Amino acid sequence: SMAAAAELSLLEKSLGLSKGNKYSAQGERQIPVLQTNNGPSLTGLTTIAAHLVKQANKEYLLGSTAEEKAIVQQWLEYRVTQVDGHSSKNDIHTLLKDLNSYLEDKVYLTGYNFTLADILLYYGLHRFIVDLTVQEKEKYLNVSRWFSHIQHYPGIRQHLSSVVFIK
Amino acid sequence: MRLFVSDGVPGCLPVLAAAGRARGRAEVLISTVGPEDCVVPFLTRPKVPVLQLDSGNYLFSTSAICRYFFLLSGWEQDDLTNQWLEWEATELQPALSAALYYLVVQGKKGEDVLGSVRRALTHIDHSLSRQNCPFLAGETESLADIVLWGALYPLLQDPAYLPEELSALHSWFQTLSTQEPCQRAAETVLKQQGVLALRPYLQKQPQP
Numbered sequence: 001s002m003a004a005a006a007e008l009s010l011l012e013k014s015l016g017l018s019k020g021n022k023y024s025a026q027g028e029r030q031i032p033v034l035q036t037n038n039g040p041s042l043t044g045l046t047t048i049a050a051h052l053v054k055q056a057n058k059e060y061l062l063g064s065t066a067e068e069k070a071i072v073q074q075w076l077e078y079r080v081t082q083v084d085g086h087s088s089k090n091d092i093h094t095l096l097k098d099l100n101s102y103l104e105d106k107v108y109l110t111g112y113n114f115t116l117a118d119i120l121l122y123y124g125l126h127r128f129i130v131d132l133t134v135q136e137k138e139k140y141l142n143v144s145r146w147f148s149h150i151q152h153y154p155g156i157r158q159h160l161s162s163v164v165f166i167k
Numbered sequence: 168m169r170l171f172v173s174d175g176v177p178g179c180l181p182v183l184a185a186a187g188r189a190r191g192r193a194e195v196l197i198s199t200v201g202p203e204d205c206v207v208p209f210l211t212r213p214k215v216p217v218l219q220l221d222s223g224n225y226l227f228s229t230s231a232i233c234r235y236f237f238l239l240s241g242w243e244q245d246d247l248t249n250q251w252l253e254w255e256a257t258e259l260q261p262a263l264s265a266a267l268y269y270l271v272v273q274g275k276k277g278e279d280v281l282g283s284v285r286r287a288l289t290h291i292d293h294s295l296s297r298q299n300c301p302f303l304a305g306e307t308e309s310l311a312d313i314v315l316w317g318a319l320y321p322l323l324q325d326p327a328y329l330p331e332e333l334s335a336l337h338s339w340f341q342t343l344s345t346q347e348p349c350q351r352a353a354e355t356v357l358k359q360q361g362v363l364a365l366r367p368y369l370q371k372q373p374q375p
Contacts, residue, residue, distance in 0.1 A: 073230070097211065101209035
């Protein structure tokens with residue numbers, strides 16, 4: 001996995017937050033911790049990510065209805081339990097197959113609206129997608145379409161390598 | 168909308184306890200299913216519980232389902248709740264999974280079970296007694312409480328597995344277990360058989 005500190009730095013810049021925070025790391029898993037000015041400390045990649053989205057006055061990225069909010073959090077949890085964990089380690093391809101089926105009829109993870117879930121899933125999948133062969137990217141047609149769209153979404157990709165897809 | 172559950176699957180515990188928050192905004196149809204029925208079209212392996220929404224979307228994450236029921240009740244998302252739920256999924260769950268496996272599958276007892284979750288239980292106790300309040304983020308039971316209770320209940324229902332030094336954890340747990348929607352869910356999911364109902368599910372799971 002991308003180090004949490006680096007991913008939060010990416011997210012800050014993609015959100016347009018001019019002042020980068022300094023994060024500490026807690027426990028053996030190096031879980032990120034944010035100390036807040038005139039607020040409590042926050043622990044956890046997705047927990048801090050949602051807080052940053054709010055700091056950027058972009059709360060719409062967390063979803064705009066009860067359903068969309070739940071779906072966003074489902075995919076954030078998916079990122080930190082399946083993509084970052086053993087599920088990806090042991091069988092990246094069943095994960096890609098399911099994600100490919102899921103994205104068959106959707107532009108973004110929730111549907112028609114871009115959310116924090118697309119950002120974090122893009123950052124989390126990036127190490128796997130860069131390693132896919134040309135044939136693998138043709139097989140996972142929907143993941144490739146979605147990934148290609150996010151990697152070109154204004155301000156998201158930053159320093160990360162572009163992946164080549166066929167249109 | 169339709170909630171799919173299966174006998175003795177521990178994830179069904181928090182979602183059933185939360186399902187009442189849906190009372191005003193929607194009817195939740197409950198469908199008791201088999202533990203290897205694949206209800207989600209885009210998922211290869213079967214997963215339960217699952218919520219099939221009126222929109223045709225699927226929630227397959229137990230915490231996301233509970234979050235949805237609370238949101239329907241008018242609950243608002245807060246950072247502390249997110250923190251608890253992220254910790255539950257990434258830190259508590261693997262520890263509980265090892266413990267319940269040791270307890271139910273291998274017949275281990277005492278510290279051979281507890282050792283796996285001691286750090287996580289201590290964390291909850293410490294947070295409950297740092298703040299002066301009886302609930303995790305709130306002044307009344309809310310989403311984090313239901314989620315953590317639902318995960319913990321299958322182990323902590325046996326008071327041998329709640330360390331006496333962790334008194335703050337102790338009260339909170341009893342307080343929640345003595346709430347009607349929790350009792351009912353506990354009864355629905357565990358069929359009043361302690362942890363015995365859990366064995367078929369826990370045996371399909373990987374050893375540590």
